[PDB]
């Protein structure tokens, strides 16, 4: 009945866990999940950017 405070609350792959291209983090926040843009080979603009999932 409660979201997981994070990946670890859920028990799942943390911020620096599951990743690859254009993904330099993947994170949960009280069930709100978020991942970050890479810091290169990107749009110089969006370089290293996120958006949550709630």
């Amino acid at each position: 009945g409660e979201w997981p405070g994070d990946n670890s609350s859920a028990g799942v792959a943390t911020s620096a866990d599951i990743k690859g291209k254009y993904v330099q983090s993947v994170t949960v926040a009280n069930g709100v999940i978020t991942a970050q843009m890479a810091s290169s080979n990107v749009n110089n603009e969006i370089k290293s950017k996120k958006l949550s999932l709630w």
Binding site: S40, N41, V42, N43, N44
Partner: protein
Amino acid sequence: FTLIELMIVIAIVGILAAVALPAYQDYTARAQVSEAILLAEGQKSAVTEYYLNH
């Protein structure tokens, strides 16, 4: 001395076939130059793409 008038017509022709052509070696150049302009244009893409990607 219509001969003069003649030689006049000669004379004015005399100094008429010399230095009465500006800038055409100048002009051909532009296109001759501009020909060179025509080519590297396509390179701009991957250049952009490289900038675009990266």
